[PDB]
């Protein structure tokens, strides 16, 4: 509920917190987690996907979804039990703006990503800080 304050990267479609570096903290059960917050600063829905250099290592929720105009979405990232964060581990936020009144169900998002020209796709990288 209460979270550490985060820096901000201002992209054209999204503001992203933190701006560049992900720090992990412990939960009540001792598990390590970090938070990414995306804020859609456009007038239309923005579709987004989260990718990583270590796809077997992290739970990422949500990772393929959409953000409403003016709204924020929390993305929770945590290494699987027994795995430890490396400074080599990076995340990629990919995002693109949809049309007015676009649907955002899974099939609709899949079709959108097939159509969107690469030049319209915003990308921003984040890097893990060791624990």
UniProtKB/Swiss-Prot annotation:
Residues 13-131 form the MSP domain. Highly expressed in CD14(+) monocytes, and at lower levels in neutrophils. Does not show significant expression in B-cells or T-cells. Residues 51-52 are annotated as: Required for FFAT motif binding and phosphorylated FFAT motif binding. The record marks 60 as: Required for FFAT motif binding. It is found in: Endoplasmic reticulum membrane. It comes from the Eukaryota. Changing residue 49 to L: Partially affects the binding of the FFAT motif of OSBPL1A. Partially affects the binding of the phosphorylated FFAT motif of STARD3. The record marks 49 as: Required for phosphorylated FFAT motif binding. Changing residue 90 to D: Prevents binding to the FFAT motif of target proteins STARD3, STARD3NL, RMDN3, OSBPL1A and CERT1 and impairs recruitment to interorganelle membrane contacts. The MSP domain is required for binding to the FFAT motif of target proteins. Homooligomer. Interacts (via MSP domain) with STARD3NL (via FFAT motif), RMDN3 (via FFAT motif), OSBPL1A (via FFAT motif) and CERT1 (via FFAT motif). Interacts (via MSP domain) with STARD3 (via phosphorylated FFAT motif); this interaction depends on the critical phosphorylation of STARD3 on 'Ser-209'. Interacts with RB1CC1 (via phosphorylated FFAT motif), MIGA2 (via phosphorylated FFAT motif) and OSBPL1A (via FFAT motif). Endoplasmic reticulum-anchored protein that mediates the formation of contact sites between the endoplasmic (ER) and endosomes, mitochondria or Golgi through interaction with conventional- and phosphorylated-FFAT-containing organelle-bound proteins. In addition, forms endoplasmic reticulum (ER)-lipid droplets (LDs) contacts through a direct protein-membrane interaction and participates in LDs homeostasis. The attachment mechanism involves an amphipathic helix that has an affinity for lipid packing defects present at the surface of LDs. This is Motile sperm domain-containing protein 2. It comes from Homo sapiens.
């Amino acid at each position: 509920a209460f979270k550490k304050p985060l820096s901000v990267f201002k992209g054209p479609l999204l503001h992203i917190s933190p701006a560049e570096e992900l720090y992990f903290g412990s939960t009540e059960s001792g598990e390590k987690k970090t938070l990414i917050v995306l804020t859609n600063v456009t007038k239309n829905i923005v579709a987004f996907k989260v990718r990583t250099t270590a796809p077997e290592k992290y739970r990422v929720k949500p990772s393929n979804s959409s953000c409403d105009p003016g709204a924020s979405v929390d993305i929770v990232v945590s290494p699987h039990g027994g795995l430890t964060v490396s400074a080599q581990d990076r995340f990629l936020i990919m995002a693109a703006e949809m049309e007015q009144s676009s649907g955002t169900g899974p099939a609709e998002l899949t079709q959108f990503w097939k159509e969107v020209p690469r030049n319209k796709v915003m990308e921003h990288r984040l890097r893990c800080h060791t624990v």
